[PDB]
Design a binder for this molecule. Structure first.
Ligand SMILES: [Mg+2]
Ligand SMILES: [Mg+2]
Ligand SMILES: [Mg+2]
Ligand SMILES: [Mg+2]
Ligand SMILES: [Mg+2]
Ligand SMILES: [Mg+2]
Ligand SMILES: [Mg+2]
Ligand SMILES: [Mg+2]
Ligand SMILES: [Mg+2]
Ligand SMILES: [Mg+2]
Ligand SMILES: [Mg+2]
Ligand SMILES: [Mg+2]
Ligand SMILES: [Mg+2]
Ligand SMILES: [Mg+2]
Ligand SMILES: [Mg+2]
Ligand SMILES: [Mg+2]
Ligand SMILES: [Mg+2]
Ligand SMILES: [Mg+2]
Ligand SMILES: [Mg+2]
Ligand SMILES: [Mg+2]
Ligand SMILES: [Mg+2]
Ligand SMILES: [Mg+2]
Ligand SMILES: [Mg+2]
Ligand SMILES: [Mg+2]
Ligand SMILES: [Mg+2]
Ligand SMILES: [Mg+2]
Ligand SMILES: [Mg+2]
Ligand SMILES: [Mg+2]
Lengths: 229, 119
RNA sequence: GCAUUUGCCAAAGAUGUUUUCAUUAAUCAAGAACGAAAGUUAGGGGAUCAAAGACGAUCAGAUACCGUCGUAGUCUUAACUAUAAACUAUACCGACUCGGGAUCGGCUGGAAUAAAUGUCCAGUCGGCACCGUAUGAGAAAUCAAAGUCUUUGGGUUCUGGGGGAAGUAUGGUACGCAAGUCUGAAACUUAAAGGAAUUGACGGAACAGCACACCAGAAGUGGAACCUGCGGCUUAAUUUGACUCAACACGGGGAAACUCACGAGCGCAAGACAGAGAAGGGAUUGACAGAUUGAGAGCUCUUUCUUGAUUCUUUGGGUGGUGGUGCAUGGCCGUUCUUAGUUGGUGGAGUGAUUUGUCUGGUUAAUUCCGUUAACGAACGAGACCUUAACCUGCUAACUAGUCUGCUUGUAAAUAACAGGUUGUACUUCUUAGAGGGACUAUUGUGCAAUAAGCCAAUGGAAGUUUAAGGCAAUAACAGGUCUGUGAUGCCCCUAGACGUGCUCGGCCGCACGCGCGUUACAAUGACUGGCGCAAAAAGUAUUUCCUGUCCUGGGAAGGUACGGGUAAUCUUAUUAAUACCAGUCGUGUUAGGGAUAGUUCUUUGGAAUUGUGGAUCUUGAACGAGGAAUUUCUAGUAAGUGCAAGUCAUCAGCUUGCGUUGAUUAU
RNA sequence: AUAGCGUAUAUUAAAGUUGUUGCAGUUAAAAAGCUCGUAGUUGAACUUCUGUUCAGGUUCAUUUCGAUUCGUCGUGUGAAACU
């Protein structure tokens, strides 16, 4: 059973090669619950040179304890980052009693959590947006992270963890600032992620004009969906 | 201790669900019906299922039953429930308005629409 | 901090202003006014309580909680003192960000009446709050501020910078009569101390389940003799494991030898395999006979004759070990517990550990179901499953079951009755036991259930307590038990007068006592003497050995071996049990109740019975007159009584595991 | 790491753990028991707004164009904030 049968309307729309690009899903803000939709846009034919290669990384694995009916019952938590270096990043975490299990479930989670980082210009606008449009802030638990845009080739100035996240996002050049208890790795990761996410939340002056008015994919593709397969 | 279990009630639901047109108030009929219709590994089991399903036939004869949705019988029951007289209650040409309703109609200006009787 | 009436004195907010002034304001080192209680000084006052104190009680000790007293205090004038968890632990002035009723004080309209210092309604200003809610905040608890904070700046005082040291030392032309207040260190030492919240565990908190836990009862143990385990105590040795359920008639643990580990005294090697030496001109084995010994153990000693590498001496080293270690371990097994519990996926909630699911409530033996439902569906466990028991005058058949039919035989007047023997293209009620039925809580119920799960009753039914009684037993544990069940083992120990393998005699059974299972009784619902065609379930011969049927002998337990059957639905046997019943004796007293303990005889199993293996006959006849504090198990063919088998086993049941017979009281 | 490399001590970043930028003070250390108040710090709104015309650049845009060239220049025209 290596063939994917979509349980989501969006899932159908994706598998059958109807919705064009991933970012489009992001645009119409269609919830992705199915961790297939994502592997779709990232083909496993394995051409080594694409920067659109989708990357997975285990970050954390934690032995979590419970006190239950006189026993001490351990599970594992894990954190996972997924990203193509080009614009797209997700973070996920899962608890399970078997390690490789926690890992798989967390990969799946992270995929469901995919988010569109926005890339801006520091100084004069020439070629590759190497950084963020504004300064922004992640907040998780106690922790805070501030992302400030840096000039060309500054590189990522940031702790090992948020650095890893940012590299997955494909921010080349950045300045970091962190508050809170940062050694809480899940909160640090979370913060960096949410921060990276807020890039598109910020209304910058270039976003000021009237947007395009389009119909949702579902309204256009309504005919397709109501055929019975 | 005669409380009946999960397996049995799921079973009975299913058996009625698909077969209601075939089923009788008689246990001895329904048990044979079940036997033909299904794979039941035990005599005892089948009989428990048949008994409960019979019980539920009787409960269905009386009215609506939670957990079982017989769409055919429910649509028949729905057509049953409609009865319409020719006059309705709703008379467009004669309608009665409170004092306060009248005040709001004054506000909109509709106080004088044809066929409006104040009370 | 302020709560009785009235009068007086000055003061205050809010509201109401088409009044006046016109920045006069905000906050605040100096400096000042207050400031609970307790305490201090000088007078008063003194009823209540009441530090100190005096006593009672409690307690191991109480200089405490409790009780009887009682001083200072408590109250009051003048004065000091300045401190509290002086608490919203939350600085003041100012903006701005949600919703909703209500409340206290003004005012503004409106409405009703019994027409007012009263009601109601709608506004609004100011107070004290509350209830929702935040796509605001926070580590959270929580917060309409604790919001408008890395998108960080409205104004202003104060305070903090890990924990202790320590509010200590010291200095105060700072205070105080004093107590003390205010100011206030460092050395030194230390990795944590600390905050919220989660899950457990626990509670001398609240609530709710369930179980013979208790309730209504019964049989009783605990009291007695004896039996059999533990512990003590003797012992050469009294082998040993196992101590609350979850050790202690448990280790199949009923031991005369054996078993067997303990004890005393003796014998063997089954010390392989390798290296060195020795050996064929001899390694080594054996053994008459005399001593010797418990012993025809050639064990030893004298005595030589055999025997012919099966190897001997060392040096290494393996076999073997009921020797240690269950806290090195496997396996198995107890126990929580047969209780009803335990998970995960996808959705919901938390930054998170985690949570919901898995629940208020009914209902069930059951997280069994119904229903509630941010949860939806599922898995394990329970159920189902499986075994035994209960129903079939219907099926399939039976000489290794029975019935009938027809013949006969005996006793009899016998197509009577009761018994045998035969019989058949016979038959299935009884008996085997295969197939298939059957029960599902069925039918009914203006019975209780919020009409849902379910419970209840009556009827039918072989069967309606989950039909009954069982087997199986999740997740997790408990360093539970087991090296002594294992040729499952790690590690440790013993290795030739061995902790190896044998033989002989003891020992585990030894008795002032303590503690457990139990058998038997204390009698009249009884004991004893007769009579009486009532069971079930188990077993059974490697041929004489195993069940045993006739028969004979003996007064008896038991012996013959005379005739026989059975490896068994055929034979023991479809019997042989005992309570029970019917007669008769005995007559409420240590009586024949009760028989412990003893002495002769006889028999049986075993080489061996002494330290009585069991059984038989005469004697002998104890405690015990219904059991203190305590406490066990148990709801129907059930308890209780009553015998029978099987395991053990040559012999030995007061034990165990089962089997029926007679059959309850009381709950449900 | 490397002809260098350990160690001790003061000091710098790490430290938004001294904080003007920039911290905390309901419960983690932290709002003074409470008012008055001088120094100090802090302070409501109003006054030549505005419009019209000229020029100079400086920027901007580009359906104005041009010239040449590897990009500046000239020019439009309007559009700005200026001066
Ligand atoms: Mg930091
Ligand atoms: Mg005085
Ligand atoms: Mg005393
Ligand atoms: Mg007194
Ligand atoms: Mg009025
Ligand atoms: Mg804060
Ligand atoms: Mg939040
Ligand atoms: Mg609130
Ligand atoms: Mg600030
Ligand atoms: Mg013994
Ligand atoms: Mg060995
Ligand atoms: Mg031995
Ligand atoms: Mg889950
Ligand atoms: Mg989840
Ligand atoms: Mg979440
Ligand atoms: Mg729970
Ligand atoms: Mg319940
Ligand atoms: Mg469910
Ligand atoms: Mg059962
Ligand atoms: Mg132990
Ligand atoms: Mg004989
Ligand atoms: Mg017999
Ligand atoms: Mg004798
Ligand atoms: Mg005797
Ligand atoms: Mg025997
Ligand atoms: Mg025994
Ligand atoms: Mg504290
Ligand atoms: Mg000004």
């Amino acid at each position: 059973k290596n063939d994917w049968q979509p349980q989501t309307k969006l899932g159908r729309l994706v598998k059958y090669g109807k919705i064009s690009s991933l970012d489009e899903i992001f645009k119409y803000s269609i919830p992705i619950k199915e961790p297939e939709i994502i592997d779709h846009f990232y083909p496993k034919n394995k051409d080594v040179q694409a920067e659109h290669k989708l990357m997975e990384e285990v970050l954390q694995i934690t032995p979590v304890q419970k006190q239950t009916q006189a026993g001490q019952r351990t599970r594992f938590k894990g954190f996972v980052v997924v990203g193509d270096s080009n614009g797209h990043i997700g973070l996920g975490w899962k608890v399970a009693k078997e390690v490789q299990g926690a890992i798989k479930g967390a990969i799946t989670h992270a995929k469901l959590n995919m988010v569109p980082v926005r890339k801006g210009y520091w100084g004069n606008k020439i070629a590759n947006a190497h950084t963020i449009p504004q300064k922004i802030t992640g907040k998780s638990g106690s922790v805070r992270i501030r992302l400030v845009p840096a000039p060309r080739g500054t590189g990522i100035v940031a702790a090992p963890i948020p650095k890893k996240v940012l590299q997955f996002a494909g921010v080349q050049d950045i300045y970091t600032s962190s508050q809170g208890c940062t050694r809480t790795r899940g909160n640090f990761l979370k913060a960096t992620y949410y921060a990276l996410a807020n890039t598109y939340r910020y209304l910058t002056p270039d976003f000021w004009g009237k947007p395009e008015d389009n119909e949702l994919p579902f309204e256009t593709f309504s005919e397709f969906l109501h055929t019975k397969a | 201790g005669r409380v009946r279990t999960k397996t049995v009630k799921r079973a009975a639901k299913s058996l009625i669900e698909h077969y209601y047109s075939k089923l009788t108030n008689d246990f001895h009929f329904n048990k044979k019906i079940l036997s033909e219709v299904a794979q039941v590994p035990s005599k005892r089991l089948r009989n428990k299922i048949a008994g409960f399903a019979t019980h539920l036939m009787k409960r269905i004869q009386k009215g609506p039953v939670r957990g079982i949705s017989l769409k055919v019988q429910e649509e028949e029951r729905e057509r049953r429930l409609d009865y319409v007289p020719e006059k309705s209650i709703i008379d467009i040409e004669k309608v009665t308005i409170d004092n306060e309703t009248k005040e709001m109609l004054k506000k909109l200006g509709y106080q004088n629409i044809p066929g409006l009787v104040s009370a």
